[PDB]
Amino acid sequence: EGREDPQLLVRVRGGQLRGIRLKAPGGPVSAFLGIPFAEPPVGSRRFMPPEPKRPWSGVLDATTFQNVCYQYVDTLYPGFEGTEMWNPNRELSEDCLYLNVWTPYPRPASPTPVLIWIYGGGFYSGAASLDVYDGRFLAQVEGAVLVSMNYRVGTFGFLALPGSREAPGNVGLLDQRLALQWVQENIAAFGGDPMSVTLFGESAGAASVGMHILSLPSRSLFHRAVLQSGTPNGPWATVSAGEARRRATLLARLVGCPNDTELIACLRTRPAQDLVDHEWHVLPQESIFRFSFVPVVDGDFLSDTPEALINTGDFQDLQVLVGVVKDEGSYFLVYGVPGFSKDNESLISRAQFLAGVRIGVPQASDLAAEAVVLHYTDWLHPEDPTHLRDAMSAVVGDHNVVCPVAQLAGRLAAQGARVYAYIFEHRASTLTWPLWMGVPHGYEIEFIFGLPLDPSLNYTTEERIFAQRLMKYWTNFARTGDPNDPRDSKSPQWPPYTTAAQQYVSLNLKPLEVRRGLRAQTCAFWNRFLPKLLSA
Amino acid sequence: EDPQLLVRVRGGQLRGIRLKAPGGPVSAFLGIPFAEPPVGSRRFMPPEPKRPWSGVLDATTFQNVCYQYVDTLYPGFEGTEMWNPNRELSEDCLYLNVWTPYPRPASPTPVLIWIYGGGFYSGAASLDVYDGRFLAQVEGAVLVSMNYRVGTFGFLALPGSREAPGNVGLLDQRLALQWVQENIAAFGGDPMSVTLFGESAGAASVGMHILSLPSRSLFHRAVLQSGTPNGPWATVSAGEARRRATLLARLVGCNDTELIACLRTRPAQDLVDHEWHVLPQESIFRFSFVPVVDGDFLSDTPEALINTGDFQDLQVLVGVVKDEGSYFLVYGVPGFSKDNESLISRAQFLAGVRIGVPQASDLAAEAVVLHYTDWLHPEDPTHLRDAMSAVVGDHNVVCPVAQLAGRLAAQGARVYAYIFEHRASTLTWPLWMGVPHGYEIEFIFGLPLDPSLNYTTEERIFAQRLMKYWTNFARTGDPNDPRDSKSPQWPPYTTAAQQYVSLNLKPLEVRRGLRAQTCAFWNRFLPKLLSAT
Ligand SMILES: *[C@@H]1O[C@H](CO)[C@@H](O)[C@H](O)[C@H]1NC(C)=O
Numbered sequence A: 001e002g003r004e005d006p007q008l009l010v011r012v013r014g015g016q017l018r019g020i021r022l023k024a025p026g027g028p029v030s031a032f033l034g035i036p037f038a039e040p041p042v043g044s045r046r047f048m049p050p051e052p053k054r055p056w057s058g059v060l061d062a063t064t065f066q067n068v069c070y071q072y073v074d075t076l077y078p079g080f081e082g083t084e085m086w087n088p089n090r091e092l093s094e095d096c097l098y099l100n101v102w103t104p105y106p107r108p109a110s111p112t113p114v115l116i117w118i119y120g121g122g123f124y125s126g127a128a129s130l131d132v133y134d135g136r137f138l139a140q141v142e143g144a145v146l147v148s149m150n151y152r153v154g155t156f157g158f159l160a161l162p163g164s165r166e167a168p169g170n171v172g173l174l175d176q177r178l179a180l181q182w183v184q185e186n187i188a189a190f191g192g193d194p195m196s197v198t199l200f201g202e203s204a205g206a207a208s209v210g211m212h213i214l215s216l217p218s219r220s221l222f223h224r225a226v227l228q229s230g231t232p233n234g235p236w237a238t239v240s241a242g243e244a245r246r247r248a249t250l251l252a253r254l255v256g257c258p259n260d261t262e263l264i265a266c267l268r269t270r271p272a273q274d275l276v277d278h279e280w281h282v283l284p285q286e287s288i289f290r291f292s293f294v295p296v297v298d299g300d301f302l303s304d305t306p307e308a309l310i311n312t313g314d315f316q317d318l319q320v321l322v323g324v325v326k327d328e329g330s331y332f333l334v335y336g337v338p339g340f341s342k343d344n345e346s347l348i349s350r351a352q353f354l355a356g357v358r359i360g361v362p363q364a365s366d367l368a369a370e371a372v373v374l375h376y377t378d379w380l381h382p383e384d385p386t387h388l389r390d391a392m393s394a395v396v397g398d399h400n401v402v403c404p405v406a407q408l409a410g411r412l413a414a415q416g417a418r419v420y421a422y423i424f425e426h427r428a429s430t431l432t433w434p435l436w437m438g439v440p441h442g443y444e445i446e447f448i449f450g451l452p453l454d455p456s457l458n459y460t461t462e463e464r465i466f467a468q469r470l471m472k473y474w475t476n477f478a479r480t481g482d483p484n485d486p487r488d489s490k491s492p493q494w495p496p497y498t499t500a501a502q503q504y505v506s507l508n509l510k511p512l513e514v515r516r517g518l519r520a521q522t523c524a525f526w527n528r529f530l531p532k533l534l535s536a
Numbered sequence B: 001e002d003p004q005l006l007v008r009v010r011g012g013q014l015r016g017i018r019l020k021a022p023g024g025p026v027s028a029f030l031g032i033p034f035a036e037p038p039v040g041s042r043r044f045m046p047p048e049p050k051r052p053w054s055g056v057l058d059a060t061t062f063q064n065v066c067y068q069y070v071d072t073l074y075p076g077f078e079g080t081e082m083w084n085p086n087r088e089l090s091e092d093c094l095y096l097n098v099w100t101p102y103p104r105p106a107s108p109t110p111v112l113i114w115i116y117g118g119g120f121y122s123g124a125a126s127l128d129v130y131d132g133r134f135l136a137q138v139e140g141a142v143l144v145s146m147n148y149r150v151g152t153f154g155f156l157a158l159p160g161s162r163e164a165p166g167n168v169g170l171l172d173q174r175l176a177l178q179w180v181q182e183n184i185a186a187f188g189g190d191p192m193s194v195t196l197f198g199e200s201a202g203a204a205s206v207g208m209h210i211l212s213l214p215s216r217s218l219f220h221r222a223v224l225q226s227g228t229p230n231g232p233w234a235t236v237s238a239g240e241a242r243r244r245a246t247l248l249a250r251l252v253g254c255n256d257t258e259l260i261a262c263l264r265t266r267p268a269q270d271l272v273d274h275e276w277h278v279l280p281q282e283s284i285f286r287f288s289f290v291p292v293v294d295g296d297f298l299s300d301t302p303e304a305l306i307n308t309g310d311f312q313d314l315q316v317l318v319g320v321v322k323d324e325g326s327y328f329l330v331y332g333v334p335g336f337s338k339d340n341e342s343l344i345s346r347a348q349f350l351a352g353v354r355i356g357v358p359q360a361s362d363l364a365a366e367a368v369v370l371h372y373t374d375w376l377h378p379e380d381p382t383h384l385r386d387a388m389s390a391v392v393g394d395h396n397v398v399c400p401v402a403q404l405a406g407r408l409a410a411q412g413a414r415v416y417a418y419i420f421e422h423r424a425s426t427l428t429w430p431l432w433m434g435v436p437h438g439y440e441i442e443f444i445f446g447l448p449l450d451p452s453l454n455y456t457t458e459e460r461i462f463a464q465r466l467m468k469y470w471t472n473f474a475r476t477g478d479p480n481d482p483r484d485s486k487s488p489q490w491p492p493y494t495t496a497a498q499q500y501v502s503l504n505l506k507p508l509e510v511r512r513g514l515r516a517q518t519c520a521f522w523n524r525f526l527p528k529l530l531s532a533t
């Protein structure tokens, strides 16, 4: 060293780092990108729990995003911004366990609350390096220290032969936990406060955050949690040991690998792409919003089902922010339900609605399905194509996200957690998905990370103010366990969600509005009746 | 003597009586026999036509009420007593009543025929709320009402037997309708324009006549107030009728011929003493002896008949009151009383549902509770009380009515539908009951026009409007006035638009969908559920 920027040089447990000075609209920030936090999970380590990164020598360059974890790449709409913004933006590799850090420039004087982002992508995809996850705005405007980590996805992350030593399951979550430990040990070197760590994540990332809440070894590695449109409970976030063993065994067959040791050994000789090419082929039914390789109820990371754990856990010491977007279901319809397309209005028939329900509620017997159809039919207009379209969207959204969220918020509150709840209702003026899809899941993220503050992205002035509000809510919550601004009582307040009053707020361009009951009547159907109905 | 009061019918001559109506006199012919007394060995048997009589038969007075259970829950309370027999009880009760304007109509006048309710176990055509003088004087209508056998005397059935074939109470009704065809012209009535209207069990009877071919040549239009032939209480199967009858016989000390012989030796009150004891479950809004699917009067179940019937050239007026269910809760459901607010616990709500839906499995009862619970206020006493009322009224009346309305409309009938929402200022039931079942009748019969009954001026005006709808419907099959050119019009109920109107003090308001989401639950989902169990 000698001529370099002295303010970009930092040591962590494994060695010296060189970061980069990024420009944000309001000033510079410090970024440390591609920090390895584990031994590369390759070769004989595929499917294995991660091991801490062995110290390196010299100054590791941390100025560029590293490899993204090997994964399926979406090709439904080739060249379309709405899909490609989620696609991997670095080389695919099994050597992918790296994390990223953004901090104020210069680094903060006093220790600073830390935000840790966990991406979604259905546990089969995702990357911490995507543009929508750019931590530079939160770091500059709110002074936050922001960490995001890559974690293994798909088979590499979640293929399990439960009980085995060579593929114990949930290693993708163990990747996440290793990164949380990394933060505890090392974040102070960046000016971050290890005694104030908030997890936040969207979709499968949100479910992941929920896993960490429910798994005892993770509990001492964070203090607060934000869950955006996802939950550890619900029909897609976990599988039984039995089902995971079935899926892993089937996948092995599909790639030529017919004792768990011998089988896993043969899978470890397969090229990564061969696994990805067959991953989607092991699902039990024709479905949407179901993923082949996800966290497994192993009796270890997860001592029991998330449902049982949220129903009996003690959460007196927890502060949780949760919420949903207005149209959780619309996105998935074009990926599997006949009649739906992003290029037309997707007006479907009654027949297509019934068929859609069987695909969107794949575990339902004929009776349960009919119950769903009867509940969601508008009997004043049972054949109106526009209603059926919107009803299909509501079915998929309610079943997979809104009602699992409503359940989680309710159980957490009842058991001593401080819960704050929202529904996000603003549609980005820059959205490229059609208008009928409303506010699809994933499209609040860019507002929470403050992308509209970047002039070049052509958001509205109103959207830039809105984005600032949201960043202020999230970082206030990070700091205090309370999204409300202390030095501001004039603005309307965000009350805690309680079982008695079930209050939550609308997040849009208009000031905070307090509402009661998260789809209360409908979620009673999904969360109380349907389980009893499927028991017959 | 007054020649306006002297009439010759096929059986001989009658003397009626001139009655005072607020706006003028009417001719009343009360207590006209239309059958041989169904006594002794005629008990449980089909009625026979009345034999000719000599001289002038005095028809200036109401005849006896059919032998029936008499309610004693609230002794001396108007809200219950107003439904109790106001004449002596007798198995000798097959008489009918006729009101005409005074003088007798110059031209043949549409006839309205009232069939009372009473759960098929009670009722009488002589009740003050069924007084026909108002419709006769004001709308110039000819009004007929008959007594028909109720309880065991009218509906005890051993299916396939000669001496208790079932449904004889409905045959009583049919004989009266036949009598009207043969005789009503002598009163200035038009036999080619006969409208049946009835309430609750009466409405369900009207419905039966719609579904029974021999009845169809005896009327042209129908009004069904808060009752239907379909639904869970109006009919029993042949197997269940047989069961209840043999249980009753065992309870009073008795092959079919001998069984029914011994029953016929039993004093009337002995049968009534036990009739409420043959029900298969602890229930409310369920009745021991009701019409039976005999494969004769009813060739098949009402549902099967409404599903396949052809109903063109039929016009129907159907409706419900705002709170069909509130009445019955005080008769069975714990926690409910007319003497307090009846604010129930959640546990009491679950208990009430098993009573109010006695046929429901555990799963089905759970579905009902989950559907009617207000999950924003799941434990609020006021909500649970009002939900209990709703469960009972929806299950037994509102959703059966919606099903009938939809089936008739789909299969060619002209249907008009209403909900009645005005609560009488004179009502003596507590406020929480709202507008209970039965309390639209006084308005339709035009009782508020009687100054001494202390109704309000607005209620008088209202009564007049209802009398117009009903008689316009009798005249034409369409409740709308052909002369009035002022909106809003009462549109026909259809399966597509599902339009109905609200009957209250405000002008007609058109609404779409009769509790359509909730009735889909009852009419479409539950039967798949109780089936799979
Ligand atoms: C929309 O387009 C898709 C394929 O392009 C098609 O399957 C679907 O039927 C269309 N829907 C409508 C309402 O046109």
Ligand SMILES: *[C@@H]1O[C@H](CO)[C@@H](O)[C@H](O)[C@H]1NC(C)=O
Binding pocket: A456, A457, A458
């Ligand atoms: C923003 O709008 C300008 C209009 O001149 C256009 O040139 C630019 O490409 C747009 N950028 C984005 C990211 O949409």
